[PDB]
Amino acid sequence: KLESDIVIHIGKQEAELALKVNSAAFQGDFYQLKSLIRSGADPNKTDYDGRSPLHLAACRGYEDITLFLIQEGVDVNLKDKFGHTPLFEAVKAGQEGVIGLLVK
Amino acid sequence: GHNDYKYIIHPKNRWYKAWEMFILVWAIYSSLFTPMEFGFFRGLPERLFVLDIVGQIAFLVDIVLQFFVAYRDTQTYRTVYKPTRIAFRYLKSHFLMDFIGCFPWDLIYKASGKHELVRYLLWIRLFRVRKVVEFFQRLEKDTRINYLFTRILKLLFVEVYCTHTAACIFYYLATTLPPENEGYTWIGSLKLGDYSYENFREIDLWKRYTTALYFAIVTMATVGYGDIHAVNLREMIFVMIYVSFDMVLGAYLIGNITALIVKGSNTERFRDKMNDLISFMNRKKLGRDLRSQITGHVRLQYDSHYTDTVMLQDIPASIRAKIAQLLYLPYIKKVPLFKGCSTEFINQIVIRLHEEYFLPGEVITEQGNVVDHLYFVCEGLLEALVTKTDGSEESVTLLGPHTSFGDISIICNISQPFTVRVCELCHLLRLDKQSFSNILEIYFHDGRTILNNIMEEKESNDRIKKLESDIVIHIGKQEAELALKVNSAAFQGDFYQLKSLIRSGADPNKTDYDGRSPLHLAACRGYEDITLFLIQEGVDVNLKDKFGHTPLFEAVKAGQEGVIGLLVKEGASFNLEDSGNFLCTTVAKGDSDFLKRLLSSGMNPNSEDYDHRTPLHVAASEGLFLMAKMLVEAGASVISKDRWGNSPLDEARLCGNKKLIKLLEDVKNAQSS
Structure with missing residues (x-):
C-alpha cells in the first residue's frame, strides 16, 4: 500500500x-548541485x-554549474517548450562567458 | 507460558520470596551447625533429635518447590515455565548434593554401629551454604548497597564460616586421639588460668566450642597469643593449612577494602580537585569572589551531573526518545518558536534533544561562529553582545526562561550573530541543526507555521530586526x-493539494x-478546474510571464478553448507588447486555428509590422482568404497601407484570389465611406 502511494509520490518527487x-x-548552490546530480534528478529531465537548468545557467551565469551540466552531457541544444535553445537566453541575458561556453 | 502449565512459581513470586528468606535462615543454621554436630558430637544426642529432623524436613520441602519454580533463561533471557524444562535444571545443577544432604546422616551413623566414616558424609550439608551465596549474589544486583561493600561483607561471612568450621575441625582432630593420650591433643593439655582442660570430652559443649573458636578467631587475625596451639601432627598440619588459606583470605579482605576506598571515591574526587585548586588560588591570591566562582564551577561539575546526561547516549534511541517525551516535552511547549504546530512535529523536536547546563558569566555561543546547535533557554537567563570595530560589545535583548535562541541563525544558515553569555545557571536544552533540518523537511506545513512564528519573533526583538533582511532572504527562498x-x-x-497549499498561505500571484503564475500552467495543461479555482483566488487573467506571455497565451498555444472561454468570461485580453505585430508573425506562421482563438480573445485587430504591414496585409498578399476574412471580422482595416503605400486590398488584387479580391474590394470601398 505504501509502495502504491509512492508509485505516484516518487513521480511527484522526481518533478x-x-x-x-x-x-x-x-x-x-553549486556544491548541492554536484551532490544532487548523483543524488537526484538529471538536467535532462525537464x-x-x-526547461533544462542549462537555460537558467545561461541566464544566471553559473558557468561552473554550466560546466557540470556539460560533463553530464546534457544537450546544449535542448530547447525549452518555448522552442528556444539555451544559447538564446545566453545571448539575451548577455552572459558573454556563458555564450562562449555554449559556442565551445 | 505460565498459564500453559500451572503450579509453577515465578522466580520472583512473593510467596517464593518469603520461602527464600525462610530457607536462607535454615541454610545459615544448617551450614553453621553441621561442623558443630560433626566435631563436637560423636553422635548427635537425643536432646536435639527433633531439631535435626525438622531441619532436614525444612530442606526436603525445598527439594520439591525448586522442581516447580521457574528460572530465567540465559539464552533467550526469558523466564521458562515448563515442569518438563524446570525439573532438568534442578536434576543437573544441584539436586544431587541437596538430596544427599537431606538424608538423616546422623541416624544412619547411629544405625550402622557408630562408624565415623559414615558421619563424614555430614559435610555434604555444607553445600546448603549455596543458599547464602545466592542471597549475596541477589543483594549485589540491588543498587541500594555497593558492589564492593557487598564483596567485603561476603568475605567477612566467608571468614565467619571458615573460622567456625576450622574450630570444629580442630576440636574433632583433638577427639580423634584416644582419651588416654588426650594429653597430646591441643585441648587435653590446655591449662588456661587455674582451669585445666584435662577431661575435655566431658566439659560443657559451649565451653569447648568457645575455646576452639577462640583459637580460630585469634588465628584468623593471626594474633597467635600461643595460649592455645597445635600439639599433634594432625593439629600441626591442619593449622598450617588453615593459616595459609586464611593468609590468602585476609589478603583478599584487605584488597577488597582497599579497592573499595580507592575506586569508590565520589565526592572525594571533587575534594582532590579542590585541594590543588585552592593551592592555586592561594599561591596566586585570587579575589574571594573569583575563588567562589571557581569553587562554584567545580561543585557545579558534580552538581550538574552532565555524566547523568552523557549516559543517555548509551541508552538506545527509542527509550531515550521516550525519556525526552516525558521530560523535555514541557520545556518544548514553552518555546515560542514552536507555539502552535502539529503535535507530531513537536514530538520529533522532543525526541532529538541534548540537555546541557552552563555557568554564570561564561559565554556559550560566539559571534561569527557558524551555528551548530539550536539552544532553548528553559530555566535561566542569557544575554548576547556583539564586539564592534572599536571592540565595545553591543548589548542585546536578554534571553529569559522558556525562550529559544540561535534559531534564527540556523534558519538563515548563518554564523552566530552575537556572542552569547550565560548570566546564571541555565537549563540549556540543545537540538542539533541537522536533526531540526530533517524534522522541518518532513513537516513542511509546521515549518511554515514556524516561519510565521519566526517573523513575529523577529519583530519581538530589535536585535534580530538587525538581521530581518537576511531572514527575509530566507523567507523569499521559502516562498520561491x-x-x-x-x-x-x-x-x-494535484487540484485539492494545491488548493490546500493556497489555503496554507500560497499566493497564486507568487512568481x-x-x-509564470500557476494560471499559465493550468491554462496550457488544460486543468480547467484548477484554472477556475485560480480564477476564484483572483489571479490576474493576463499576468505577463518572464517570457512576455499571458496565461491565456499558454491556453491558446495548446488551444484549450475550455480554459480560453473560461478566461474570456473573466475578460480575457492578451494586451501583449506588439500583439498585433505578433499577429503579423502568426499570419507568418499560418495557423488559422491559433489565429481564431487569439482573435476570439481579440488582442488587436491589425498592426503594422517592421515592414509596416498589418497582418491583413500579410494574409492578403499570401492569399490566405480565411485568415484575412477572420481578421476583418476582428477589425483588421483594409484602408491601412504598408510601408510602400499598398493596402491589403492591393495585395489581394496582386494575388488574384477571386473570393479574397471581392471581400477586400467590398470591405475597403465600404470603409472609405
Whole structure:
C-alpha cells in the first residue's frame, strides 16, 4: 500500500527534484548541485515548461554549474517548450562567458 | 507460558520470596551447625533429635518447590515455565548434593554401629551454604548497597564460616586421639588460668566450642597469643593449612577494602580537585569572589551531573526518545518558536534533544561562529553582545526562561550573530541543526507555521530586526520553493493539494523561476478546474510571464478553448507588447486555428509590422482568404497601407484570389465611406 502511494509520490518527487535542480542553477548552490546530480534528478529531465537548468545557467551565469551540466552531457541544444535553445537566453541575458561556453 | 502449565512459581513470586528468606535462615543454621554436630558430637544426642529432623524436613520441602519454580533463561533471557524444562535444571545443577544432604546422616551413623566414616558424609550439608551465596549474589544486583561493600561483607561471612568450621575441625582432630593420650591433643593439655582442660570430652559443649573458636578467631587475625596451639601432627598440619588459606583470605579482605576506598571515591574526587585548586588560588591570591566562582564551577561539575546526561547516549534511541517525551516535552511547549504546530512535529523536536547546563558569566555561543546547535533557554537567563570595530560589545535583548535562541541563525544558515553569555545557571536544552533540518523537511506545513512564528519573533526583538533582511532572504527562498510546488501541482493535477497549499498561505500571484503564475500552467495543461479555482483566488487573467506571455497565451498555444472561454468570461485580453505585430508573425506562421482563438480573445485587430504591414496585409498578399476574412471580422482595416503605400486590398488584387479580391474590394470601398 505504501509502495502504491509512492508509485505516484516518487513521480511527484522526481518533478520536485527537477525543479530543485533548476532552483540550484538559479540560486547558485553549486556544491548541492554536484551532490544532487548523483543524488537526484538529471538536467535532462525537464520541468512543467520543459526547461533544462542549462537555460537558467545561461541566464544566471553559473558557468561552473554550466560546466557540470556539460560533463553530464546534457544537450546544449535542448530547447525549452518555448522552442528556444539555451544559447538564446545566453545571448539575451548577455552572459558573454556563458555564450562562449555554449559556442565551445 | 505460565498459564500453559500451572503450579509453577515465578522466580520472583512473593510467596517464593518469603520461602527464600525462610530457607536462607535454615541454610545459615544448617551450614553453621553441621561442623558443630560433626566435631563436637560423636553422635548427635537425643536432646536435639527433633531439631535435626525438622531441619532436614525444612530442606526436603525445598527439594520439591525448586522442581516447580521457574528460572530465567540465559539464552533467550526469558523466564521458562515448563515442569518438563524446570525439573532438568534442578536434576543437573544441584539436586544431587541437596538430596544427599537431606538424608538423616546422623541416624544412619547411629544405625550402622557408630562408624565415623559414615558421619563424614555430614559435610555434604555444607553445600546448603549455596543458599547464602545466592542471597549475596541477589543483594549485589540491588543498587541500594555497593558492589564492593557487598564483596567485603561476603568475605567477612566467608571468614565467619571458615573460622567456625576450622574450630570444629580442630576440636574433632583433638577427639580423634584416644582419651588416654588426650594429653597430646591441643585441648587435653590446655591449662588456661587455674582451669585445666584435662577431661575435655566431658566439659560443657559451649565451653569447648568457645575455646576452639577462640583459637580460630585469634588465628584468623593471626594474633597467635600461643595460649592455645597445635600439639599433634594432625593439629600441626591442619593449622598450617588453615593459616595459609586464611593468609590468602585476609589478603583478599584487605584488597577488597582497599579497592573499595580507592575506586569508590565520589565526592572525594571533587575534594582532590579542590585541594590543588585552592593551592592555586592561594599561591596566586585570587579575589574571594573569583575563588567562589571557581569553587562554584567545580561543585557545579558534580552538581550538574552532565555524566547523568552523557549516559543517555548509551541508552538506545527509542527509550531515550521516550525519556525526552516525558521530560523535555514541557520545556518544548514553552518555546515560542514552536507555539502552535502539529503535535507530531513537536514530538520529533522532543525526541532529538541534548540537555546541557552552563555557568554564570561564561559565554556559550560566539559571534561569527557558524551555528551548530539550536539552544532553548528553559530555566535561566542569557544575554548576547556583539564586539564592534572599536571592540565595545553591543548589548542585546536578554534571553529569559522558556525562550529559544540561535534559531534564527540556523534558519538563515548563518554564523552566530552575537556572542552569547550565560548570566546564571541555565537549563540549556540543545537540538542539533541537522536533526531540526530533517524534522522541518518532513513537516513542511509546521515549518511554515514556524516561519510565521519566526517573523513575529523577529519583530519581538530589535536585535534580530538587525538581521530581518537576511531572514527575509530566507523567507523569499521559502516562498520561491513554495511557488515551485504550486506550479508543479498545476502541472501534475494535484487540484485539492494545491488548493490546500493556497489555503496554507500560497499566493497564486507568487512568481516562480519561470515567473509564470500557476494560471499559465493550468491554462496550457488544460486543468480547467484548477484554472477556475485560480480564477476564484483572483489571479490576474493576463499576468505577463518572464517570457512576455499571458496565461491565456499558454491556453491558446495548446488551444484549450475550455480554459480560453473560461478566461474570456473573466475578460480575457492578451494586451501583449506588439500583439498585433505578433499577429503579423502568426499570419507568418499560418495557423488559422491559433489565429481564431487569439482573435476570439481579440488582442488587436491589425498592426503594422517592421515592414509596416498589418497582418491583413500579410494574409492578403499570401492569399490566405480565411485568415484575412477572420481578421476583418476582428477589425483588421483594409484602408491601412504598408510601408510602400499598398493596402491589403492591393495585395489581394496582386494575388488574384477571386473570393479574397471581392471581400477586400467590398470591405475597403465600404470603409472609405
